[PDB]
Design an enzyme around this catalytic site. Structure first.
Site, PDB file in Angstrom:
ATOM      1  N   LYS A   1       0.784  -1.248   0.000  1.00 49.04           N
ATOM      2  CA  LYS A   1       0.000   0.000   0.000  1.00 49.04           C
ATOM      3  C   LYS A   1       0.810   1.289   0.000  1.00 49.04           C
ATOM      4  CE  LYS A   1      -3.120  -1.294  -0.592  1.00 49.04           C
ATOM      5  NZ  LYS A   1      -3.319  -1.897  -1.950  1.00 49.04           N
TER       6      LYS A   1
ATOM      7  N   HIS B   1       7.228  -7.493  -2.303  1.00 42.60           N
ATOM      8  CA  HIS B   1       7.044  -6.793  -1.021  1.00 42.60           C
ATOM      9  C   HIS B   1       7.882  -7.572  -0.008  1.00 42.60           C
ATOM     10  CE1 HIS B   1       3.602  -4.654  -2.570  1.00 42.60           C
ATOM     11  NE2 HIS B   1       2.863  -5.745  -2.667  1.00 42.60           N
TER      12      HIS B   1
ATOM     13  N   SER C   1      -4.899   2.446   4.523  1.00 43.56           N
ATOM     14  CA  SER C   1      -5.017   1.858   3.191  1.00 43.56           C
ATOM     15  C   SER C   1      -5.017   0.331   3.268  1.00 43.56           C
ATOM     16  CB  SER C   1      -3.848   2.301   2.299  1.00 43.56           C
ATOM     17  OG  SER C   1      -3.952   1.712   1.010  1.00 43.56           O
TER      18      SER C   1
ATOM     19  N   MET D   1      -5.543   6.698 -13.436  1.00 48.63           N
ATOM     20  CA  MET D   1      -5.302   5.298 -13.116  1.00 48.63           C
ATOM     21  C   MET D   1      -6.509   4.601 -12.503  1.00 48.63           C
ATOM     22  SD  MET D   1      -1.266   5.197 -12.115  1.00 48.63           S
ATOM     23  CE  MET D   1      -1.459   3.421 -11.723  1.00 48.63           C
TER      24      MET D   1
HETATM   25  N1  LIG Z   1      -1.639   7.469  -9.407  1.00 47.56           N
HETATM   26  C1  LIG Z   1      -1.852   7.380  -8.086  1.00 47.56           C
HETATM   27  N2  LIG Z   1      -1.700   8.497  -7.325  1.00 47.56           N
HETATM   28  C2  LIG Z   1      -1.779   8.381  -5.976  1.00 47.56           C
HETATM   29  N3  LIG Z   1      -2.114   7.302  -5.245  1.00 47.56           N
HETATM   30  C3  LIG Z   1      -2.205   6.202  -6.027  1.00 47.56           C
HETATM   31  C4  LIG Z   1      -2.117   6.154  -7.417  1.00 47.56           C
HETATM   32  N4  LIG Z   1      -2.303   4.862  -7.874  1.00 47.56           N
HETATM   33  C5  LIG Z   1      -2.637   4.194  -6.794  1.00 47.56           C
HETATM   34  N5  LIG Z   1      -2.521   4.925  -5.633  1.00 47.56           N
HETATM   35  C6  LIG Z   1      -2.793   4.509  -4.253  1.00 47.56           C
HETATM   36  O1  LIG Z   1      -1.753   3.647  -3.801  1.00 47.56           O
HETATM   37  C7  LIG Z   1      -2.299   2.732  -2.794  1.00 47.56           C
HETATM   38  C8  LIG Z   1      -2.043   1.308  -3.224  1.00 47.56           C
HETATM   39  O2  LIG Z   1      -0.638   1.044  -3.254  1.00 47.56           O
HETATM   40  P1  LIG Z   1      -0.086  -0.354  -3.770  1.00 47.56           P
HETATM   41  O3  LIG Z   1      -0.150  -0.271  -5.257  1.00 47.56           O
HETATM   42  O4  LIG Z   1       1.269  -0.391  -3.140  1.00 47.56           O
HETATM   43  O5  LIG Z   1      -0.974  -1.342  -3.109  1.00 47.56           O
HETATM   44  C9  LIG Z   1      -3.777   3.124  -2.650  1.00 47.56           C
HETATM   45  O6  LIG Z   1      -3.839   4.133  -1.640  1.00 47.56           O
HETATM   46  P2  LIG Z   1      -5.222   4.454  -0.878  1.00 47.56           P
HETATM   47  O7  LIG Z   1      -5.717   3.168  -0.349  1.00 47.56           O
HETATM   48  O8  LIG Z   1      -4.707   5.284   0.238  1.00 47.56           O
HETATM   49  O9  LIG Z   1      -6.039   5.138  -1.919  1.00 47.56           O
HETATM   50  C10 LIG Z   1      -4.066   3.699  -4.035  1.00 47.56           C
HETATM   51  O10 LIG Z   1      -5.239   4.491  -4.144  1.00 47.56           O
HETATM   52  O1  LIG Z   2      -4.134 -10.171  -3.599  1.00 47.03           O
HETATM   53  N1  LIG Z   2      -3.303  -9.841  -2.743  1.00 47.03           N
HETATM   54  O2  LIG Z   2      -3.338 -10.361  -1.631  1.00 47.03           O
HETATM   55  C1  LIG Z   2      -2.262  -8.831  -3.020  1.00 47.03           C
HETATM   56  C2  LIG Z   2      -2.208  -8.225  -4.276  1.00 47.03           C
HETATM   57  C3  LIG Z   2      -1.218  -7.263  -4.533  1.00 47.03           C
HETATM   58  C4  LIG Z   2      -0.289  -6.908  -3.533  1.00 47.03           C
HETATM   59  O3  LIG Z   2       0.650  -5.975  -3.824  1.00 47.03           O
HETATM   60  C5  LIG Z   2      -0.324  -7.506  -2.260  1.00 47.03           C
HETATM   61  C6  LIG Z   2      -1.314  -8.473  -2.001  1.00 47.03           C
END
Ligand SMILES: Nc1ncnc2c1ncn2[C@@H]1O[C@H](COP(=O)(O)O)[C@@H](OP(=O)(O)O)[C@H]1O
Ligand SMILES: O=[N+]([O-])c1ccc(O)cc1
Ligand SMILES: O=[N+]([O-])c1ccc(O)cc1
Length: 288
Positions: free
Chosen positions: A41, A101, A131, A225
């Site tokens: 996240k 991760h 998140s 996105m």
């Molecule tokens: N272009 C963008 N700008 C800012 N936040 C973004 C983004 N694309 C995805 N995110 C946010 O990044 C988080 C997910 O991260 P990951 O890809 O590591 O799982 C989510 O945060 P939120 O849950 O706070 O919205 C998501 O909305």
């Molecule tokens: O499905 N999943 O559990 C996930 C998917 C994406 C990620 O970056 C971490 C966990």
């Protein structure tokens, strides 16, 4: 459904991801691979889209060739009925973009031996916690999250998928002193995306005209996105991720944690944070 976490070498992992570590032992890194590494996240999907765009020379069409999880293989990924990251990896052409991760204790050694460049993204712990809580609800391979109150407690002691956020950001920061690592902050990307994208370009050794960078800033914005099916994860099976519970592209803001943390939770969290981050030179911004 909602299987419990499996502990591997001190790290709690999603059951299926722990099983994925066996075949991952055969993984061979290439000198031209690039590893995107993050604690869950923290901006993984965001930086992945940016990197793929750079690799495709800014061609938005080439980026829609397939969903992000197919374009950037997720190393330790595995789930019933879905191909594993290792399986997807076999059909991925070099130069490859790879996602993980995994904490350093489990990272395949080949990546470090081959001196693979790493793009690490860190995000303030409070927004990460909020998140992650919602993600736990929508991504059904995770165990039941319980109440926000109980989840926060588990987060603070690292009893969540992938372990301690505190250990993760610190060990990768330390690694950056002796390995090629570009250490980014989600908040910096939020504040000035063009500035951060430029840093990435210089790191990977690519040059693009300003017009193209401006174009990338626009197409990698949260609004864009969230609507793009090739990045918002809506094409995955409902049994795997249920966007009606919570969308993957949820809010995309820095500072959102303030509307979820109660004052009592904030005081407890800050006192705990001070102890855990005492000897670290890392500095995070919780707003802006
Ligand atoms: N272009 C963008 N700008 C800012 N936040 C973004 C983004 N694309 C995805 N995110 C946010 O990044 C988080 C997910 O991260 P990951 O890809 O590591 O799982 C989510 O945060 P939120 O849950 O706070 O919205 C998501 O909305
Ligand atoms: O499905 N999943 O559990 C996930 C998917 C994406 C990620 O970056 C971490 C966990
Ligand atoms: O990470 N994920 O959520 C994924 C990864 C690969 C896939 O085929 C489907 C979903």
């Amino acid at each position: 459904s909602r299987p419990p976490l499996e502990y591997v070498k001190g790290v709690p992992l999603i059951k299926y991801f722990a099983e994925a570590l066996g075949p991952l032992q055969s993984f061979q890194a290439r000198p031209d691979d690039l590893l995107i590494s993050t604690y869950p996240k923290s901006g993984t999907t965001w930086v992945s889209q940016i990197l793929d765009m750079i690799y495709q020379g800014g061609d938005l069409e080439k980026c829609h060739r397939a969903p992000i999880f197919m374009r950037v293989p997720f190393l330790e990924f595995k789930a019933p009925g879905i191909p594993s990251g290792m399986e997807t990896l076999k059909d991925t052409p070099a130069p490859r973009l790879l996602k993980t991760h995994l904490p350093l204790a489990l990272l395949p050694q080949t990546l470090l031996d081959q001196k693979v460049k790493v793009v690490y993204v860190a995000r303030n712990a409070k927004d990460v916690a909020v998140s992650y809580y919602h993600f736990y609800h929508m991504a059904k391979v995770h165990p039941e999250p319980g109440t926000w109150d109980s989840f926060l407690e588990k987060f603070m002691v690292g009893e969540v998928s992938y372990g301690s956020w505190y250990q993760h950001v610190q060990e990768w920061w330390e690694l950056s002193r002796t390995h090629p690592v570009l250490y980014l902050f989600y908040e910096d990307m939020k504040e000035n995306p063009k500035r951060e994208i430029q840093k990435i370009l210089e790191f990977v050794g690519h040059s693009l005209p300003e017009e193209t960078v401006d174009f990338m800033v626009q197409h990698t914005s949260f609004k864009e996105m969230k609507k793009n099916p090739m990045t918002n994860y809506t094409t995955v099976p409902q049994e795997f991720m249920d966007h009606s519970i919570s969308p993957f592209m949820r809010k995309g803001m820095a500072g959102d944690w303030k509307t979820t943390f109660t004052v009592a939770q904030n005081e407890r969290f800050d006192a705990d944070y001070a102890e855990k981050m005492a000897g670290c030179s890392l500095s995070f911004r919780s707003e802006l």
